[PDB]
Amino acid sequence: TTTYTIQLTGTSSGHVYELYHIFSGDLDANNVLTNIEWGAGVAIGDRAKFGDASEKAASLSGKQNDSSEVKAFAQELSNSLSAAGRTRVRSEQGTTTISGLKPGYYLIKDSNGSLDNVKGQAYTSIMLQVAKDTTIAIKSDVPTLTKQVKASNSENYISATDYAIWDTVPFQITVTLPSNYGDFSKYHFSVKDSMTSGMINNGDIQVYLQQGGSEVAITDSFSITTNNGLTVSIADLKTLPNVNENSKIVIRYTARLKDSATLGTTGNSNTASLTYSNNPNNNASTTAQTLDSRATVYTYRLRLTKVNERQERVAGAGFTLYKKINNQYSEVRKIEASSSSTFDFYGIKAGDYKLVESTTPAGYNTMKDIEFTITSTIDSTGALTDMTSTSATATFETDVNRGYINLKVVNKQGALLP
Template identity: 40%
Template sequence: MKHLSKMLKGLVAVFAAAAMALTLAPTAFAETSYKLTLNGTATGHTYEAYQIFTGDLSTNAEGKKVLSNVKWGTAYTGTESAADVAKALGDGTMKIEELEEKLTLTKPVKTVTSSEGSTVIDGLAAGYYLVKDKDGTQANTSDAYTTFIVQVVGDTEADIKSDVPTVQKKVQDTNDSTDTTSDWQDSADADINDEVQYQITGTMPDNIADYTTYKYVFTDKMSKGLTYTAGKATIKIGNKDVTKSFTENVTPNTDGGTTVTWSCDNLKGIDGVTLDENTTVVVTYSAKLNENAVIGANGNPNTVNLTYSNNPNKGGDGETGKTPDDKNIVFTYKTVVNKVDQDTKSLAGAAFKLEKKLSDGTYKEVKSFTAGKETTFEFNGLDDGDYKLTETATPAGYNTIVPIEFTISAEHDTESDDPKLTDLSGDVKSGEAKFTADTNTGSLTTDVVNKKGSTLPSTGGMGTTVLYVAGAAIVVAAGIGLALRRNKRQDA
């Protein structure tokens, strides 16, 4: 919001005009009261109006409304001449900070509760007013204290702008099969044990110059599916690494998650750093997606907020505000394989190995099972990408399947305050399978069929008899042939 020192600089000429009015022949107006309309207000504020200067409302030789016979309002209790102070402010011989020291802000002439959109302070006599948030009313809110001076020489309007920092949390999405990495966005997917890359960006308020000190604290709350290792963050202001100017604190939460804070008591005290309204503070770090990761649509969220100094009237010390949480999320999936025979009945005795295809064409094993009584095999914690399912043990009497190559594809909101998993699919490239997708559970399920192999008939069966007969015929034929050859030799 527009604070005292910032606003007064723009009113120097007005104060000079007020001082000049003392020497001009004004045209006086009848005593009346006016209203001040504050535009752009939000609920949750209590505004106080303090009268700094009062006087006679007049029109000077230039036709402008001014105050003549300027004197102190109720916000001043000293003995100095109001006209002299106004003149000193006008010609620059008195600093704004000196005026602040002269004011006693204990008796507002008006106190109002803010409304959404605009707020009216009425019943004001002509004069100059300092309007401010009541002390203690903006502690731990997402807003900041405001202080500004406005001239009231008729019904007047003033614009209120919220000068508070913002914070934004982003994540990168990497596909190991294609070796592609996304821009910073609000969602990603990953394999269990992947290191997920995060970035937090905090901004400055427009009135950062009005603060003597400026507290700045990032609070990042990670769900239990994410593991952060202390000391892995890098913090920069522009190109300058300021990590050592922040204190990191890692705290386990009762729900199994972790809260990490990076705090600096005074950004303005960091050597070599100059802050302005365009300055950003950027935190980058990685966290591992661990074995506790939630599979499917609920995902693995983390949130961040920023605690900041919000009272420039006290130099920045003391009270702080806090931004709303900014959320992002990492999704992970699973493949479920049901082993069945050609009649779709569950079939025990199989074993499988799942591998992920990497960008260089090699394969990395995800998980393998040994043969046993299991007929359902779950491969949990999978990213999008290309995979190969191989049957490493086959039930007795059945043929081994051709390896199944397939691609997991997913879509999720990349720009959203509350990112959602919107689509999941499994596309078979080779082998025989058909995946059924469930975005809620994050699962791709398929039946894998083993077919019975070809075997010789058992001993004594018709097939064996045929073989015996065929064998005997061959022996007889051989005997006849031998006898014929002997007879030919004897005749010769």
């Protein structure tokens, strides 16, 4: 006899695909099926409710694979299956091949319960396929979620950057929808974000529908809660009619660093994941969760220690920190004079700065202004690898791991000229 192959592309490891023999027959060179009977994949009891196999086949002849009558037949068959005509195949990553199939029409699905509570997976849309030695794409996909933060020094969104205490930290979660979104009757959609422990959320969260190079706000259609992380949910995304398989859902919000934010290489991280409907068949209500997407924000502490040439600690200095925008230095932080001899500028980032001694301790020369540059090196993985602090007129000591930048300001007395 003759046997045929179905090769499924876009498959993932960890699945068990089932092929049910719906129709037997003979396949010609034009992929036309003759001499049609019911295959063993359809339970004998349920066959009579479809009628004669040949005439059922004839009624579908020439219709689109994604036409309504064929989708209907697939879903009805799914409740009429028999193990008698079943072939189970463990999936491979990329491409899964099933050879030695009896000729005819097959129903393809994921084995029941095989993906329950498995992250980043979904049950395939039930497929009807003629076994004809060809490759087809599995009608299965998962949504993706990416959490990003706006780069400190540009407009683009990346996984990690550095920020200062005076900055607003913009975050952006981008969700893509599965290619088979249309097959779902309803679509559960819930984004959970851990938020960042060393930051305060500004509560300015908005949700956008992004497609065709444009954005529309859809925030009011979502439930936005803070009982279990920051959660942004809609019971059924299908109630938004302009959302489709090619739509992107984008969540934006901003935060700001606390004065207790983690310094140095550990960073201040948050993770986000999506909970989604993972089975488009039989109006199912099971969900799965995407893997976490992480974003990180680094920051440093600049410490000044005010001393004199006698190596004594000196109180009563005051410092004004400027950061360079263009050619224009702009005041970002001031520490007024006190009994303190230490000055902590907690939450500083890469950039060009100027430090001014706005108040000089009694009986000492005013320090000359110090211009300095902080650099941050963040590798492709988003890890902070290096940090430096340098000036043409001063020396800093740095600890990249702890995120410390230390400057000793040496106060010197004037001249007694008798």
